[PDB]
Amino acid sequence: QAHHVSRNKRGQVVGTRGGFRGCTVWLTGLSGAGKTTISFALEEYLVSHAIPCYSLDGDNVRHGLNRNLGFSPGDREENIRRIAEVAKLFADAGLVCITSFISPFAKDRENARKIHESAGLPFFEIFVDAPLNICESRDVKGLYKRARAGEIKGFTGIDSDYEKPETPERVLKTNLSTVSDCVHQVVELLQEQNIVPY
Amino acid sequence: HVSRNKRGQVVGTRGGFRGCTVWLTGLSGAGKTTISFALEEYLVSHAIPCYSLDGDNVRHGLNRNLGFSPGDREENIRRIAEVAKLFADAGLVCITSFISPFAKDRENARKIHESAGLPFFEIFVDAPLNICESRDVKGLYKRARAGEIKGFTGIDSDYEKPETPERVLKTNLSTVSDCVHQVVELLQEQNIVPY
Numbered sequence: 001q002a003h004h005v006s007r008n009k010r011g012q013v014v015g016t017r018g019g020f021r022g023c024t025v026w027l028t029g030l031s032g033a034g035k036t037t038i039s040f041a042l043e044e045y046l047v048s049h050a051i052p053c054y055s056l057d058g059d060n061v062r063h064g065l066n067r068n069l070g071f072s073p074g075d076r077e078e079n080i081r082r083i084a085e086v087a088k089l090f091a092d093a094g095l096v097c098i099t100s101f102i103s104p105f106a107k108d109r110e111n112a113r114k115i116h117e118s119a120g121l122p123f124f125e126i127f128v129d130a131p132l133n134i135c136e137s138r139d140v141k142g143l144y145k146r147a148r149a150g151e152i153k154g155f156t157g158i159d160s161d162y163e164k165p166e167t168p169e170r171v172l173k174t175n176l177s178t179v180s181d182c183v184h185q186v187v188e189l190l191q192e193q194n195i196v197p198y
Numbered sequence: 199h200v201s202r203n204k205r206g207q208v209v210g211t212r213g214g215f216r217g218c219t220v221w222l223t224g225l226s227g228a229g230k231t232t233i234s235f236a237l238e239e240y241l242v243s244h245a246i247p248c249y250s251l252d253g254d255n256v257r258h259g260l261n262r263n264l265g266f267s268p269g270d271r272e273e274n275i276r277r278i279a280e281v282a283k284l285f286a287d288a289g290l291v292c293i294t295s296f297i298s299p300f301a302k303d304r305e306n307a308r309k310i311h312e313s314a315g316l317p318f319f320e321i322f323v324d325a326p327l328n329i330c331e332s333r334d335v336k337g338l339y340k341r342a343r344a345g346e347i348k349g350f351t352g353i354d355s356d357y358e359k360p361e362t363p364e365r366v367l368k369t370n371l372s373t374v375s376d377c378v379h380q381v382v383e384l385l386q387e388q389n390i391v392p393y
């Protein structure tokens with residue numbers, strides 16, 4: 001062990017609310033299912049309620065920490081591994097960490113879970129669940145049309161699998177309710193787990 | 199995303215935005231772990247949230263797949279540099295304590311911070327090699343001398359002294375407490391820590 005200030009000591013100074021509330025909210029689901037959106041609205045809820053948080057997504061990860069990674073199966077596995085480890089470092093610093101990666105394979109998700117659990121840090125797996133056709137009609141970034149046209153391969157939902165989370169902590173049905181309803185589902189969980197005040 | 203500023207408000211009881219990376223560099227045994235801890239403890243006792251990145255929480259996690267080949271050591275520091283930035287972006291004071299022997303790697307670390315408007319402070323934890331070796335804190339020197347670890351900085355690979363670091367800490371000539379103080383002064387001068 002390296003000698004550091006304890007998690008419980010860190011709990012006094014992080015944010016106003018006392019207590020160690022570090023953890024990772026791990027959003028998973030199809031491209032366009034609603035991860036970036038839910039993550040933004042959660043981040044807003046958290047900041048508005050004075051709970052320090054940080055979001056890892058493609059914007060701060062992919063052209064930095066993971067800029068030396070491409071799309072081979074081994075590289076995508078490394079992608080998620082690195083993400084999971086850093087998320088764990090943010091949980092351990094006492095921040096609420098929100099990740100928003102399609103993270104299709106149970107193996108990688110369950111591995112993310114395991115490193116948090118090993119460290120005694122809460123991990124909430126959140127299935128951001130919409131049907132593929134609905135995601136494909138949103139085509140937020142034009143990836144589906146590129147993937148269909150063969151300009152991208154290995155694109156989850158088209159020529160690689162999304163493996164539905166078996167026991168996620170919440171399922172957000174994003175084609176059947178509002179952003180606000182979906183967020184509220186995550187917020188309730190954080191309440192029930194004492195991360196976020198009533 | 200919520201503006202960096204707005205995230206800053208809620209990080210601690212102190213106000214504003216105090217995210218930055220404090221980058222210690224120096225020979226093995228010079229004083230990085232000791233300065234870090236004391237500085238970590240100064241920040242906590244002043245209600246400024248901070249986080250330390252060291253061999254312990256990085257080497258068997260994020261960087262578990264990196265050996266001691268030169269390329270791996272370059273990647274080791276690159277990854278660390280990026281994470282520090284994420285912590286400074288998150289609004290925490292991030293303290294790193296890696297022998298970061300090469301100017302190139304260090305300046306690369308600063309650069310990814312400067313691009314993003316994130317203060318970066320290179321601290322030169324400077325003690326002479328002979329003193330570090332008499333210290334032999336974790337027994338690494340006599341092991342390196344004995345052929346068990348190769349490429350050990352100061353022994354069979356170079357340590358490049360920082361040209362223009364923000365503070366120099368002469369850890370053979372003053373106390374831990376006086377050393378931390380040069381850093382804390384820097385932090386106060388630069389509006390990360392209040393007077």
Ligand SMILES: Nc1ncnc2c1ncn2[C@@H]1O[C@H](COP(=O)(O)OP(=O)(O)O)[C@@H](O)[C@H]1O
Pocket residue numbers: 029030031032033034035036037038100138140173174175177178179180182
């Ligand atoms: N309940 C909901 N949750 C999240 N997104 C929703 C919801 N209802 C509609 N949407 C819309 O679906 C799209 C989701 O895109 P995005 O959030 O970028 O997906 P991802 O981050 O998973 O790739 C957005 O335009 C969003 O406004």
Ligand SMILES: Nc1ncnc2c1ncn2[C@@H]1O[C@H](COP(=O)(O)OP(=O)(O)O)[C@@H](O)[C@H]1O
Pocket residue numbers: 224225226227228229230231232233295323333335368369370372373374375377
């Ligand atoms: N001014 C000083 N700053 C830091 N350490 C000092 C100082 N004076 C004596 N020491 C001692 O030198 C040793 C440095 O070891 P350490 O901090 O573990 O080295 P590093 O972490 O840089 O490899 C510790 O025993 C520390 O107490």
